[PDB]
Amino acid sequence: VPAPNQQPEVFCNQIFINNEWHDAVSRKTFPTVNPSTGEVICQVAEGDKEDVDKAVKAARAAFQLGSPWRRMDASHRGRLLNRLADLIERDRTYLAALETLDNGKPYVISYLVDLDMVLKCLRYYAGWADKYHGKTIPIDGDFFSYTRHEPVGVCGQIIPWNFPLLMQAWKLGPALATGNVVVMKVAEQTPLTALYVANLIKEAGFPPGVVNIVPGFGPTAGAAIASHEDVDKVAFTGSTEIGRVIQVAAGSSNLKRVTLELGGKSPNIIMSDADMDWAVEQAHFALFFNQGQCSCAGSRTFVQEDIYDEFVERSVARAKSRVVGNPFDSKTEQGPQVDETQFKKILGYINTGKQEGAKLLCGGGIAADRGYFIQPTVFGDVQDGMTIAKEEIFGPVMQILKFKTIEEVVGRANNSTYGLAAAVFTKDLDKANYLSQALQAGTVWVNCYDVFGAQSPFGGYKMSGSGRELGEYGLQAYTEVKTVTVKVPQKNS
Amino acid sequence: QAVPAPNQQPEVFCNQIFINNEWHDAVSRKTFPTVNPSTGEVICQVAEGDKEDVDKAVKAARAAFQLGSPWRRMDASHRGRLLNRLADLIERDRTYLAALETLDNGKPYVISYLVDLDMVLKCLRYYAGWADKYHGKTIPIDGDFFSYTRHEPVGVCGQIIPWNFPLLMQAWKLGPALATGNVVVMKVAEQTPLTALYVANLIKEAGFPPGVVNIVPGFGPTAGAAIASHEDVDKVAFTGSTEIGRVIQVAAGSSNLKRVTLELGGKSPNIIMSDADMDWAVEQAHFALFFNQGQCSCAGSRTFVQEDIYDEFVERSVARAKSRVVGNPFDSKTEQGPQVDETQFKKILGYINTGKQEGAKLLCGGGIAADRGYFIQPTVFGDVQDGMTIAKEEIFGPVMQILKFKTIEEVVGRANNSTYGLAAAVFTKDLDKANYLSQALQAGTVWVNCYDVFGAQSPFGGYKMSGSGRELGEYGLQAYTEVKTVTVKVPQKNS
Amino acid sequence: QAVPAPNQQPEVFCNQIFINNEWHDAVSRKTFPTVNPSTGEVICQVAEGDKEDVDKAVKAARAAFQLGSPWRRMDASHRGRLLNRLADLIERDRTYLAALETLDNGKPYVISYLVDLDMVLKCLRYYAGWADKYHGKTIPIDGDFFSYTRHEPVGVCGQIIPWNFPLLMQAWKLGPALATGNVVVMKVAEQTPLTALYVANLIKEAGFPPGVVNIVPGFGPTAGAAIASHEDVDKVAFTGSTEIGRVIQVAAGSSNLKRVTLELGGKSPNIIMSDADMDWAVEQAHFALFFNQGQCSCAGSRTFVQEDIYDEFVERSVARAKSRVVGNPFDSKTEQGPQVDETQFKKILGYINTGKQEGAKLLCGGGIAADRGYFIQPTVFGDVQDGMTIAKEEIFGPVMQILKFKTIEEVVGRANNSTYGLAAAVFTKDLDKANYLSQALQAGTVWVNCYDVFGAQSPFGGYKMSGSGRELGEYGLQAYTEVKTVTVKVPQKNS
Amino acid sequence: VPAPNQQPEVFCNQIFINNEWHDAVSRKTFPTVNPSTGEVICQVAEGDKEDVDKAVKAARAAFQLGSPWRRMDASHRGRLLNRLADLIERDRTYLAALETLDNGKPYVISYLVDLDMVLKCLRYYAGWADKYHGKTIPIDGDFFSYTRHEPVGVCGQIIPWNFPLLMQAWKLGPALATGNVVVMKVAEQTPLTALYVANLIKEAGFPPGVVNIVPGFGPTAGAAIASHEDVDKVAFTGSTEIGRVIQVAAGSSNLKRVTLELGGKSPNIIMSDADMDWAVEQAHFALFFNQGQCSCAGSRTFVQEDIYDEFVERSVARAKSRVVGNPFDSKTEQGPQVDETQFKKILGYINTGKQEGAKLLCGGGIAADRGYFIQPTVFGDVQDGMTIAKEEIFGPVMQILKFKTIEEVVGRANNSTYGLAAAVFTKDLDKANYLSQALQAGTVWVNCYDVFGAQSPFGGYKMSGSGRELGEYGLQAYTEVKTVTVKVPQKNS
Numbered sequence A, D: 001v002p003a004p005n006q007q008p009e010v011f012c013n014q015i016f017i018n019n020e021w022h023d024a025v026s027r028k029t030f031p032t033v034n035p036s037t038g039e040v041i042c043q044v045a046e047g048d049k050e051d052v053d054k055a056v057k058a059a060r061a062a063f064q065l066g067s068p069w070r071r072m073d074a075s076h077r078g079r080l081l082n083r084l085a086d087l088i089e090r091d092r093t094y095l096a097a098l099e100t101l102d103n104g105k106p107y108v109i110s111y112l113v114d115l116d117m118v119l120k121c122l123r124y125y126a127g128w129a130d131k132y133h134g135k136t137i138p139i140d141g142d143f144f145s146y147t148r149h150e151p152v153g154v155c156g157q158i159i160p161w162n163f164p165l166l167m168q169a170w171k172l173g174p175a176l177a178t179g180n181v182v183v184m185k186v187a188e189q190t191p192l193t194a195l196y197v198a199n200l201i202k203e204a205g206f207p208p209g210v211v212n213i214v215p216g217f218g219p220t221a222g223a224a225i226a227s228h229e230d231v232d233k234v235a236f237t238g239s240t241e242i243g244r245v246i247q248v249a250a251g252s253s254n255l256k257r258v259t260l261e262l263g264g265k266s267p268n269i270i271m272s273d274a275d276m277d278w279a280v281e282q283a284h285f286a287l288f289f290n291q292g293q294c295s296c297a298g299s300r301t302f303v304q305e306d307i308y309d310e311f312v313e314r315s316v317a318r319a320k321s322r323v324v325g326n327p328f329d330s331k332t333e334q335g336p337q338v339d340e341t342q343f344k345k346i347l348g349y350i351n352t353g354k355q356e357g358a359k360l361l362c363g364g365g366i367a368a369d370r371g372y373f374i375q376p377t378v379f380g381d382v383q384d385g386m387t388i389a390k391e392e393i394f395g396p397v398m399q400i401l402k403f404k405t406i407e408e409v410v411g412r413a414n415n416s417t418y419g420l421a422a423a424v425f426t427k428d429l430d431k432a433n434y435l436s437q438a439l440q441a442g443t444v445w446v447n448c449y450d451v452f453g454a455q456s457p458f459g460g461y462k463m464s465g466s467g468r469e470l471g472e473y474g475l476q477a478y479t480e481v482k483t484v485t486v487k488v489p490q491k492n493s
Numbered sequence B, C: 001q002a003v004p005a006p007n008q009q010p011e012v013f014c015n016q017i018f019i020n021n022e023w024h025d026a027v028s029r030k031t032f033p034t035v036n037p038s039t040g041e042v043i044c045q046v047a048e049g050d051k052e053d054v055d056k057a058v059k060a061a062r063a064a065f066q067l068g069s070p071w072r073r074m075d076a077s078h079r080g081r082l083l084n085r086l087a088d089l090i091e092r093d094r095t096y097l098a099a100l101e102t103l104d105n106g107k108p109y110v111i112s113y114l115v116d117l118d119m120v121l122k123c124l125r126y127y128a129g130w131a132d133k134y135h136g137k138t139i140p141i142d143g144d145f146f147s148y149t150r151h152e153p154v155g156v157c158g159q160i161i162p163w164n165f166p167l168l169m170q171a172w173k174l175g176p177a178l179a180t181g182n183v184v185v186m187k188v189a190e191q192t193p194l195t196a197l198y199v200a201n202l203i204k205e206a207g208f209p210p211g212v213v214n215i216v217p218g219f220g221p222t223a224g225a226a227i228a229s230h231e232d233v234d235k236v237a238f239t240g241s242t243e244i245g246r247v248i249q250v251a252a253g254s255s256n257l258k259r260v261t262l263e264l265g266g267k268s269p270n271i272i273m274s275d276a277d278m279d280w281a282v283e284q285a286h287f288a289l290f291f292n293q294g295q296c297s298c299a300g301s302r303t304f305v306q307e308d309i310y311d312e313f314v315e316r317s318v319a320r321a322k323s324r325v326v327g328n329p330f331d332s333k334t335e336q337g338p339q340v341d342e343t344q345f346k347k348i349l350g351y352i353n354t355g356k357q358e359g360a361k362l363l364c365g366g367g368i369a370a371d372r373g374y375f376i377q378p379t380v381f382g383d384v385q386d387g388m389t390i391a392k393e394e395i396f397g398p399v400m401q402i403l404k405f406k407t408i409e410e411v412v413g414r415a416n417n418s419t420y421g422l423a424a425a426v427f428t429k430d431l432d433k434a435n436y437l438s439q440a441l442q443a444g445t446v447w448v449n450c451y452d453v454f455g456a457q458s459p460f461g462g463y464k465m466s467g468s469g470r471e472l473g474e475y476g477l478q479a480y481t482e483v484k485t486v487t488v489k490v491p492q493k494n495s
Ligand SMILES: NC(=O)c1ccc[n+]([C@@H]2O[C@H](COP(=O)([O-])OP(=O)(O)OC[C@H]3O[C@@H](n4cnc5c(N)ncnc54)[C@H](O)[C@@H]3O)[C@@H](O)[C@H]2O)c1
Pocket: D158, D159, D160, D161, D162, D185, D186, D187, D188, D216, D217, D218, D219, D220, D221, D222, D223, D226, D237, D238, D239, D240, D242, D243, D245, D246, D260, D261, D262, D263, D264, D294, D295, D296, D392, D394, D420, D459, D464, D465
């Protein structure tokens, strides 16, 4: 890993519309903080409804029949996505450092995980741009019938702060591969890296108005997108509570199409025949990755009785060894939480765990006197009705639950309004097949956790959301299907 | 001609709530009348299902969907066999069901038999074939993993349908849902409950496990709303008005974030270029608008005609509308039966009044066609302009709007200047005009030299406020599929 | 148990050449006997089709395929309906056809009824569902063009099939060919012509247009060769021996470059790891080899067993083979009927003799089981080694080879050290062993903890000299599809 | 277009195996000629059976389970294809000049058409490498059944001289995208550009043995590949007569899988309502492109009676204007034919046309005293039984036939043992739909000709071959389908 610049310069802090940079109409700004220190990095333009309106107008113009973007060869959309990826790779060291600065995650992880996954996502989707065929369809009668896979049009895309660049890429790849135009609302905690990437979108040669980015708050700019009468589709990643708000805003306005990637309380099931230390280390990763700030987090670790004591002992030792510190130090495993709001809320959940009778095995408090650092925390003897067992914590707080039978753990795993992900650790073919079929989750990992690939789709069951991102499936939400049915003189096979 | 003679007074056998392969009164014991629109007389009372009935239906559907249940364990091919058996039973009872359809809805019996029932049979048979063919994927993910997707059912599917094509809308919903192994709670329209309840009896006869299909007749803001807001319904599919579409999507968001697909209203443009075949275009434009008493969101309700042929097109269209026979729908000479109910009757008369007052030229019809039932004269307005109410709002009756245009660029902009986008058509002999217009129109279906050409193979649904999602075709399965990725660590991935 | 009682002397109704929905003698007026293998007696004479008969059949098929013909114009969904009607007719006549199958081929009636006929019905019904679902594509080519593909039929398809599963091999061929709108000239095996000719009668009854399916019984180097070399056959599909596969592919190349798919021989490995469920593995290994009198290219004819369990596996396998009932195939207690003919009888006895002489341990059987018909004792060889003839060559009879191995790396190399590659299986409780072996084996089907699990949904066919192409599944349509790209200049391409 | 080097240096003239360069075992060589001058460019290693054997052994080793190529991520195969394309683009000016030197086609066309299409083909297929999914299949019973899309293994690929680099790319793109290994036999007339590209395959980082190239003759090296007992699959592009030989060699050996892209006598149908000058110019291109050396050539130009005289007059004027000359001169439209054999054979066909009663309207003779240049030749009043109407000429010899009705022209167009391509020129929707359905051809162009895209498949009906190249379809011939059917405890939907 190239040595980081621990104070990367910030070049882009405004609203991006028609490949130009704007202040907000109000000229208001908001601070973004470095969570390692609690100090302001810079001010950022505070986009609201009137800024969103400009962005939507720009997007709609760029989507007009006969525009450069509408007429461009699909293969050329792919070329432009590949060019974007090459520019990100050129600027990989900078972007990883800026990602760490704004978000808090370790720089080694920003570089080797986030930036790698961004490159792979964009390059994957570049390949789709000229391959998502419609159909020729052997309808009854003397007709030629076929489908066109058109773009849906103006796509509102609202993303969170936990993986700023990667969440941007998961949205832009499929939308652009299929010829949509975008109005993106980046998270107020972490706007900077996506704004830099907008500069690279301009540099790559995307036509103006194809990607517009409005930094600002959720109930102002975000809600303006979800409520807008000329936005055709919204994709939202965030909390389940806000997903409700989005779907109500869509239905209340123009019945735009909605996909949602929401919260989780994902069960990680360790059968007694698992490989012990692999299970312990994967369970540790499953929960603590990215400071616990993952909707995918394995935050109910179900451990079979016969291995429970050993598994717990090992898990506690591993949590106690996990290095919390400055995210630019290569020894650091865990940076701060993103902001003070999250910091306080996680400490609040920890206090609920103690009060409700879970066993605090390690951690439980603040880890530093500056920035938002929380000790890696492990609770044992967790039970299904506890707050920490039910609600998404989004911090470094692990729940270990004991179970006896496979039928029992299916029922407890599934007894959630969430269904984003799950995992099973076992050597047994039959247990793996049974559990992967039975679990009500959009991704089931077997003998692994948090294995993402641009090829394989991701998304929720139940209140974890609707639709899928990544893979071929990621294109469906960005496609408007048009049937053309043509009278012909004489149909033949 | 193969249309068998109808019973004009088909007996009603089924008029209750259908839950777990059982027939029940409403919890309240209330009933509501359904009326024969040809006479205004009550056919029979039907159980008035409400929230408590919907709750029982959802519990029965949930029980049928439990892991390990007969419906969950059944071979996909066997789901196909069940769909084909249901189709056979409907075919057995085709003459009866077509007559019952006409009795309760008002459409001509010949059309109930040759269109509605034929399309029901073809839709169920088409989807039977999908049951064991909607594959998931094996995916060559990076690293030492085997990754694949399972195409699972979503679960408990609430399905709310309108009165315009009672049996066909039932089949568009049941076919993909059942093919993919979902379970159903269906709320049929209060104006047309009877044929769908008969089909429930045939579902039971076919051997579908109890609870797989449940039907709750009742009103919209009671039973329909209870489905849309229910905390244990995983998915809702709604076909109806754009206005109630907004209610459904808000209910979904405000309750449990159930998945939502919508098939809503239209104001579809039918574009006649000056090189069209005139005779063919005139008759197809007539069909496009007047089919099913005008009660189709598909309807070609903005007939755009190029100025060089406009006068002749209008004269020929008026002639044809004057010749269109309004009558008892059991008479095979009848082309147009009554509108479905008194509310619709009055609304359409209201739109006709608006049309006259806002400056459209009334060229024929415009009034009541009979002193009993809900019959309206075929009505043609000429010199219609884009800003008129009758050019913007869906009338849902036998009221035709003819507009004049000059150029292709003009007519693309005018046709697309709507919040609706369900369908469109272009009539032209030219290859290049056909290709350009079919690309340019913002509509979910574009017909070329035809109109109202539906096939179970080809998807249908809206752009813009005409809805979200597609019915029919392979696409119709997407809304009923929950995709699960399974990603397995392996010892050594090889190609 | 739902197996209906058989007629042990089913009447033969159809014994001629089937062309254009007509029954004909051979041009030569020659006939050939088909024999009941249970008794060695002639059932009846069958018309002996040759080149001149094949020429008439091909002309009838070509006429049925002409542009504008009823079969070319027919709706794809209607091709589906015809396939479903044929299935219904076969189901109507299931008891008869299962008995006739057993009479002519020798397999147990219970298996003819519950396996062969069930699978025929499921195959035709599966493919009926594909008829209107094998979409071409709309393709976003560079430039101002609209490009798409049509999935057309190839045309006149020559289909040559063996005697081991007469009706099922007929259905594997007809299902995809007819679903995609091809026409067929089929050459059935001379040992088992009768059931396929009956099914021709049902094809006619179902309403397929004349000439769409034509059947020529006769010999291989006469009628079969005439099909493979014919200048007006567009495609041949052959299932049979690897040796005749080479003849077919050479004939195709030497005549008109017709398209060729082949389903050939096997020497499939069945690998029992030491953590297998022993009782289950023993019974499945027994089935794997002995199913259908050993007459299956699918057969698990190299049973590899890990050394820690080898002795017990062998003792239990011998016990089971000693218990396997050989008898009249109409007796429901019979597990093994006769071999199909005297040539096969002698060949298998020859392989048994080779096995003994080349050092394999004869553990049971090895001889003739009855003094009439072609019955062979279930035969088990232990301590089989890779270089033995009985470990390399396909025996096609009730002769089981058990080999010992130690390691996974070893058994992958040994299993793959064959020019065959049709199927394979692994028995293990471990996830990682199952995944690794399923990736590593060079076989078109790998079964895990099972054997001989066929479904119309899942493709089947060879690696290496076991053949080219796949039957069953969506994949089975590929060989019957001619892809046409249509690329149209348009005024202005938009996304 | 960058100015060409009219004498580019030749770096690579040997057999390429395991990313190394070898003489033939025999140490024999063969000359490759510059067809513009008839002079030898250089000697090339003359590969035969023993060289093929080495190549097949190298390919088989590279395909072993657990090899680098077998274990590489599919996405990484795509990266390597993209890297290959970038290296070709780096060396585009050189490769276009070498292509012209060896083959004869104009340098402007080598640069703007061949090299562009090579880049686009490789970049298209790079995108497929991680997207050609197998299936999960809802079989009856308590089983999990799925397909793996494996590679077929060792793929013999035999290509012609008419589009040397492009034919290489049409073969390598799909084979490598799907993880096969290759033994390629390049045409003896034009070996040089493909050998240079092998050097770029090494430079790109493909593992040794993944691509092996054996220059040499057809009945020696080509036949050795088609007959080889350890080649799993052969793809052959060439003449129909040799396609027969290939299929016989496959059936006579190991029953390898065979696809064939063979000859043509493609009908180009001009209806009376066509746009005249567009039809004339497209018909001219259709026949004369690439010195007539295209199996796709529109070599039966069917012209409706009412436009025949004008169409012919215009076609003759255009042929008389077509500039024959040095292919490095930017004014040159037509270079020489590839070799003396072709030169003589084309002159022989011209003499048959004269003798059988076709009307020679222009050309008909040699166009220069050095190199293999033939005048653009147009025959009128051609009839269906004439040699020039039936047989593939593969030179600048145009056939114009007159017809009256659409039913007549369908029957005459289809009355051929060839079926590679066809076209219709018309304004009429119904005529276009009828003819495109009725014509027995693998590609039907409407109001265009020779419109190729990597997205859209190409290949023959009848004796024009089997299988398709380009598009998703191009992957099918390179995929070995494996069904895995696994007993499970309890199947659920
Ligand atoms: N359908 C298509 O896509 C397509 C494309 C380009 C060219 N073509 C055909 O290209 C041909 C190329 O020129 P050609 O006339 O020299 O073709 P050809 O068939 O003689 O040669 C084609 C290739 O096959 C090799 N070959 C020749 N004899 C062989 C044999 N006995 N065994 C194995 N390989 C052998 C040649 O060396 C060369 O590499 C044209 O005749 C045309 O018919 C077809």
